[PDB]
Amino acid sequence: HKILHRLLQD
Amino acid sequence: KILHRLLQD
Amino acid sequence: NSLALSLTADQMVSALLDAEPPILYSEYDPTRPFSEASMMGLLTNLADRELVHMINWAKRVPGFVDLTLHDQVHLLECAWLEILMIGLVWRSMEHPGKLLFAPNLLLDRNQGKCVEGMVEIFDMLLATSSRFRMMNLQGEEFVCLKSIILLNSGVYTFLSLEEKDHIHRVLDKITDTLIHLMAKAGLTLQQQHQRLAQLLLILSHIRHMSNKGMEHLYSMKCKNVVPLSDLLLEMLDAHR
Amino acid sequence: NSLALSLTADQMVSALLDAEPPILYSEYDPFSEASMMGLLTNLADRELVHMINWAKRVPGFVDLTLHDQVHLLECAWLEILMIGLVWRSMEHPGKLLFAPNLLLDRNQGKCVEGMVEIFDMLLATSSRFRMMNLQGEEFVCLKSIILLNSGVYTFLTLKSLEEKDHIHRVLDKITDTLIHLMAKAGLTLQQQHQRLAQLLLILSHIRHMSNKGMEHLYSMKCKNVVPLSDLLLEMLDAHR
Ligand SMILES: C[C@]12CC[C@@H]3c4ccc(O)cc4CC[C@H]3[C@@H]1C[C@@H](O)C2=O
Ligand SMILES: C[C@]12CC[C@@H]3c4ccc(O)cc4CC[C@H]3[C@@H]1C[C@@H](O)C2=O
Numbered sequence: 375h376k377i378l379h380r381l382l383q384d
Numbered sequence: 385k386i387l388h389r390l391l392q393d
Numbered sequence: 394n395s396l397a398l399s400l401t402a403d404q405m406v407s408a409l410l411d412a413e414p415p416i417l418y419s420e421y422d423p424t425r426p427f428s429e430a431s432m433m434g435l436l437t438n439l440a441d442r443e444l445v446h447m448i449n450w451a452k453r454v455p456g457f458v459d460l461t462l463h464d465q466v467h468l469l470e471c472a473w474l475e476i477l478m479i480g481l482v483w484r485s486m487e488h489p490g491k492l493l494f495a496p497n498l499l500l501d502r503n504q505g506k507c508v509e510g511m512v513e514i515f516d517m518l519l520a521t522s523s524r525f526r527m528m529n530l531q532g533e534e535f536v537c538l539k540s541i542i543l544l545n546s547g548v549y550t551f552l553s554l555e556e557k558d559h560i561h562r563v564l565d566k567i568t569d570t571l572i573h574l575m576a577k578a579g580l581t582l583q584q585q586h587q588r589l590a591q592l593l594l595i596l597s598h599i600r601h602m603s604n605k606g607m608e609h610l611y612s613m614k615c616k617n618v619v620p621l622s623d624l625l626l627e628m629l630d631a632h633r
Numbered sequence: 634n635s636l637a638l639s640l641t642a643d644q645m646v647s648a649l650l651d652a653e654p655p656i657l658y659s660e661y662d663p664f665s666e667a668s669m670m671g672l673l674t675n676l677a678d679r680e681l682v683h684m685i686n687w688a689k690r691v692p693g694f695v696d697l698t699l700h701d702q703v704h705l706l707e708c709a710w711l712e713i714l715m716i717g718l719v720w721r722s723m724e725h726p727g728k729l730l731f732a733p734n735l736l737l738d739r740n741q742g743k744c745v746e747g748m749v750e751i752f753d754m755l756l757a758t759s760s761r762f763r764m765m766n767l768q769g770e771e772f773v774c775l776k777s778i779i780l781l782n783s784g785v786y787t788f789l790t791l792k793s794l795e796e797k798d799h800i801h802r803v804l805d806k807i808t809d810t811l812i813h814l815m816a817k818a819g820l821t822l823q824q825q826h827q828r829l830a831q832l833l834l835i836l837s838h839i840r841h842m843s844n845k846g847m848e849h850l851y852s853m854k855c856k857n858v859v860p861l862s863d864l865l866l867e868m869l870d871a872h873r
Contacts (some may be wrong), residue, residue: 593833604844
């Protein structure tokens with residue numbers, strides 16, 4: 375699970 | 385340097 | 394979709410202008426000695442915090458949010474240090490000889506020498522800044538460049554033939570915007586394309602810098618000088 | 634004293650078409666990784682001496698000091714080798730035509746550790762060229778910009794400053810040439826600016842790959858899988 379992946383919908 | 389030579393030649 | 398595509402030139406540069414991220418400050422505490430590990434830690438700290446605003450800016454760039462997360466992630470992974478670097482150069486523009494990382498972190502040539510490998514990149518970064526000043530870069534020219542670096546830099550390493558060209562279709566819009574700005578500044582049709590080329594030719598120098606710095610950054614992680622935000626670790630790991 | 638400045642738009646494209654290097658051959662005849670990188674490096678080493686004559690023959694280039702030509706070329710060499718190769722493999726989807734009898738599949742690049750990622754970027758790149766139907770008279774302009782743009786902000790007096798502006802002067806001429814060509818093919822202004830950009834925006838990709846191919850090239854020499862020529866060594870050591 376990528377930090378960037380989550381940040382982009384955060 | 386090789387390139388140096390090659391430039392003047 | 395078309396939100397992005399159905400934009401005026403001026404609606405365009407407006408949207409880019411207000412998407413601008415804030416200039417952050419440095420955790421720099423001057424009542425302590427300057428280490429290679431100290432100032433590498435300062436910069437990466439600063440950088441890590443800057444990535445989070447960049448990610449918000451990105452989503453605020455027309456066209457961008459229309460990509461799936463894999464493409465958004467890939468664009469942002471491939472373009473991130475370039476965007477950090479073009480921002481930094483803008484910042485220190487009217488500080489010749491210096492690089493303004495944060496208004497409380499303003500470094501110069503020698504100060505780069507405090508950590509090994511760093512100075513070569515300082516030197517180029519400085520030169521890129523001088524060239525922007527020589528060329529009298531406008532902020533409306535800068536935000537467009539920034540948006541181009543986002544969309545273009547990773548575009549050729551994902552291809553998805555139809556995401557491909559809608560990225561291409563936005564990137565076109567931006568050169569249109571960029572030109573329309575040059576027209577409006579009162580540049581002649583031949584100055585318009587001449588300068589368009591000058592700007593875009595620097596982006597290549599910026600890709601050259603990003604790559605060198607990405608290589609330096611990787612060295613620090615490997616010589617263990619500083620610990621790196623788990624997020625920065627993911628960014629560097631997107632490179633190899 | 635600068636009569637590369639007094640060229641006409643067509644005396645230019647014809648000058649550059651005229652300087653084009655010949656298309657070298659492999660001396661190739663089981664595929665080892667040291668076997669094939671032997672192949673690609675003795676090919677590239679031959680390539681380099683032809684490139685130097687073609688450099689001398691790019692209008693405005695021999696006006697430059699000898700030390701300035703050196704650096705432009707050790708900065709620009711692998712980029713030029715790649716854009717050439719990418720042009721070569723244009724009408725060969727999926728395959729990289731290094732020599733007429735050495736056309737590697739995007740799979741045979743697995744034969745060298747981490748070579749395949751680079752293959753793919755080159756493949757991506759010619760796929761781009763192909764799809765935007767890049768013309769041969771543009772390619773030679775592209776190829777000339779690359780030599781002139783790549784190392785020009787790594788200059789660092791009053792006289793050394795006029796070099797920068799000299800070469801920026803010719804670089805603006807090659808823009809006018811590129812754009813003349815597009816006027817001639819019947820592209821509207823908008824289609825002109827926009828394609829100008831498209832071409833210049835891929836030059837950053839080229840620079841990316843050059844950067845990346847230079848650290849592969851370097852990791853290859855260090856574990857000594859094949860002996861590099863002396864010129865090839867020099868070309869590489871200059872980046873480090
Ligand atoms: C990534 C970096 C540490 C952080 C620096 C940085 C940090 C913040 C910023 O806004 C711009 C830059 C530009 C260069 C960046 C450096 C280049 C590289 O040498 C390095 O370690
Ligand atoms: C130098 C090289 C091996 C030889 C290749 C090569 C060899 C011949 C040629 O005409 C073009 C190219 C383009 C890329 C070049 C490769 C890139 C780099 O990964 C490498 O090891």
